[PDB]
Amino acid sequence: SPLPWCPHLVAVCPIPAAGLDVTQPCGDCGTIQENWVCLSCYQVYCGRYINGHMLQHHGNSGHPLVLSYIDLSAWCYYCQAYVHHQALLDVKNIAHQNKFG
Ligand SMILES: O=C(O)CCc1nc2cc3nc(CCC(=O)O)sc3cc2s1
Ligand SMILES: [Zn+2]
């Protein structure tokens, strides 16, 4: 049951020119596992169970919201919750198309 809104949705940006690549590896360690994409700047970094690079990215940029390339959920690091909202539908849909074909 994600939150239906959070105060950080305002920081969600339009996706890169080239679209999304759900097989893009972590920009720091290159892992192919458990990556997330940043919904502000669209850099890709790994989850807390691999090397924690997305949490590091959150700390060093302040960017709030990230989308999972495993299950297309969106986490806000400030609110410490999952969020779903209209503002996230396009990025979720584009990711889902790229993932499942
Ligand atoms: O496990 C606990 O201590 C209880 C509360 C939780 N912390 C989480 C952190 C978390 N970070 C996410 C973004 C991706 C990443 O950096 O791994 S999704 C996600 C889900 C949970 S549930
Ligand atoms: Zn990494």
Ligand SMILES: [Zn+2]
């Ligand atoms: Zn970012």
Ligand SMILES: [Zn+2]
């Ligand atoms: Zn938030």
